[PDB]
Design a protein around this ligand. Structure first.
Ligand SMILES: O=C1CC[C@@H](c2ccccc2)N1Nc1ncnc2[nH]c3cc(F)ccc3c12
Length: 167
């Protein structure tokens, strides 16, 4: 048993809710919150900009030090950093950005990072400003992640479409 509340169960291990991931993280304080990161960990907009804003820019300060030491992530890759006031840890995962012409095939590799964590609160990778089809992202999530994932979908109309179209 865990404290995630109000989720619809899609499969044995995937759950979904219409929620703001920032507000969800603040309430639950999960062990792991996933950020929709880019390779530079520049948290300007989308989920990343919102998570970073909620940390009062501490996520960005930590991220800039990480990049200065280690260089950029790979598309499809991840790193574990602090969750600040939102979670114990933040798993920064880079899904492909279609608006940069990145290979959508890399979305499966991106979701594989979730399997290193038993339970996660996460957004749909490559959705939103990353330009992929969220229905496709949900399918890849369900077919790739084997650990317990709680998906927060900000947009109510999209949440309803994702549920109603789920196979
Ligand atoms: O609704 C959806 C489906 C796709 C996904 C997404 C992913 C990367 C970039 C943009 C959008 N996304 N966005 C969110 N998902 C969950 N909680 C969120 N809190 C936010 C607060 C904000 F200021 C802006 C957006 C979100 C948000």
């Amino acid at each position: 048993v865990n404290s995630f509340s109000g989720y619809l169960k899609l499969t044995d291990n995937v759950y979904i809710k219409n929620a703001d991931i920032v507000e969800e993280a603040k309430k639950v304080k999960p062990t792991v919150v996933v950020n929709a990161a880019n390779v530079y960990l520049k948290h300007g907009g989308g989920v990343a900009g919102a998570l970073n804003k909620a940390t009062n820019n501490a996520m960005q300060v930590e991220s800039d030090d990480y990049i200065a030491t280690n260089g950029p992530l790979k598309v499809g890759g991840s790193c574990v950093l602090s969750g600040h006031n939102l979670a114990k840890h933040c798993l920064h995962v880079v899904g492909p950005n279609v608006n940069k012409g990145e290979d959508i095939q890399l979305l499966k590799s991106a979701y594989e990072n979730f399997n290193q964590h038993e339970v996660l609160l996460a957004p749909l990778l490559s959705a939103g400003i990353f330009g992929a089809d969220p229905i496709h992202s949900l399918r890849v999530c369900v077919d790739t992640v084997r650990t317990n994932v709680y998906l927060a979908v900000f947009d109510k109309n999209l949440y309803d479409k994702l549920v109603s179209s789920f196979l």
